[model samples]
Target: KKIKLNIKEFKATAEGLSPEEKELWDKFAEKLKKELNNKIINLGEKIEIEEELKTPTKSIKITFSLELVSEDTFKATLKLEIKGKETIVEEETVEFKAGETVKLTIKLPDGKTFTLELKLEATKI
Candidate 1:
């Protein structure tokens, strides 16, 4: 399957800023808006091991969250829960120039059928 994601619109507020500070804030917001406009954020799907194996496997829930930190940086957070208890959590920050792909993989407990694979890419419109 093919999936596509885009950066949500950014809104900045400087309601109480001094005139000088407001000017700087406006410039910063404009720069960020220009870079993020029409940019693409890619994500892979969440796969459940039990369903894939068609057999008894570890009972766990896995999820991931991603953020675009900057034009050249991003962050990912991974969580693993077992039997209604949270077990493992991991986070990573990576740097990538435009057109580069980021791939993250996580292995589950024994008897599972699939691994968690997250693929992210930043690109222009």
Candidate 2:
């Protein structure tokens, strides 16, 4: 199976901001969005598949891609393939800043014998 992902629209408000500060904030937000928009980030091999039963297993692999929608928001895509026969994909847009961690847990079809865990941290240089 094949899957596609999308980013959701985000909204924000500044409460109790002076007019001057609001102007500055708007300018900064625009600049940041222009600089970081559509930037793709590779999160590396974040998913780990483990076998709990002693049996022959098929090869499993996972990959992730993150797109920057803003300075503090990202759209993340995760793909899982099992022996090139089955594929699972998940997508989410989250309000995450640099230095924050995200975790995902997946249960295999068996629901008990096999599991996958994904953990990632956003970073910028």
Candidate 3:
């Protein structure tokens, strides 16, 4: 079965930011979410998504490297790059869930905490 991949939302939040920085980051996050909303793809096949978004002073990049593993399972590798913060390249073995979400955290060298919330859905067909 091929899994239909849907992007519900991708959100970002940060801790330890100046007021101005926080406002700018929020704008960047919202822009990123808009560009990702409702994006769709089919799994269990080749996947290549090299998308990037930018705000006035911030930028974000996304890429997908995936493979179907066992039944109803897949290997998910996400390369998320946010300029001015540490880039994240993480992999996980995800069990397909109809309405599920995955979350990741980033720790910048400046002692700031950043959170990435990814809401997604997978339908087996």
Candidate 4:
């Protein structure tokens, strides 16, 4: 009865950004790693990560909303704040096995979205 959630990976990226914005995005990406990379969780535990981060030029924010569906199943949500607009890029409940690579995305006014690639696993500690 000893298990924990292992965050194997987490990353964020965007497309169609200008050279300047892309640079900001790159810095933000590293910040994402600091936020969620190698995170650990226990069964029945809920974690919420919220922070407003600033780039050298523009501003941005990020959030995390987690839900426990069951002993081994859970739901997760991620939102990215851009230009005073926030969006639910990815939110769903999935059965967690050894691990799964969850892809997160973003939504734009034109129906576009940011992107993320992450891996989570449950294993004995």
Number of backbone-clashing residue pairs for each candidate, in the order shown: 0, 0, 0, 3
lDDT per model vs. reference:
0.40, 0.37, 0.56, 0.60
| Alpha-carbon runs more than 4 Å astray in model 1 | 1-59, 84-95, 109-125
Candidate 2 structure quality by residue, lDDT tens digits, 31-118: 4334334433443322221211111443444343455455555454434344534444333334354444443333445441211122
Alpha carbon deviation, residue 50, candidate 4 (Å) = 4.1
Tens-place lDDT per residue, model 1, 4-112, is 3333433344344445434544554454445444544543332211110111433444444455555555555444444433344333334444344444444444322
Q: Which candidate number would show the highest TM-score if scored against the true structure?
A: 4
After superposition, the stretches of candidate 3 with alpha carbons farther than 4 Å from their true spots are 1-11, 18-24, 44-71, 74-98
Query: lDDT score, residue 87, model 3?
Result: 50
Off by over 4 Å in 2: 1-59, 83-95, 112-125
Model 2 poorest ten-residue lDDT run: 46-55
| Overall local distance difference test of candidate 1 | 0.40
**lDDT sort, best first:** 4, 3, 1, 2
User: TM-score for each prediction?
Assistant: 0.37, 0.34, 0.47, 0.59
- Between candidates 2 and 3, the one scoring higher on lDDT is 3
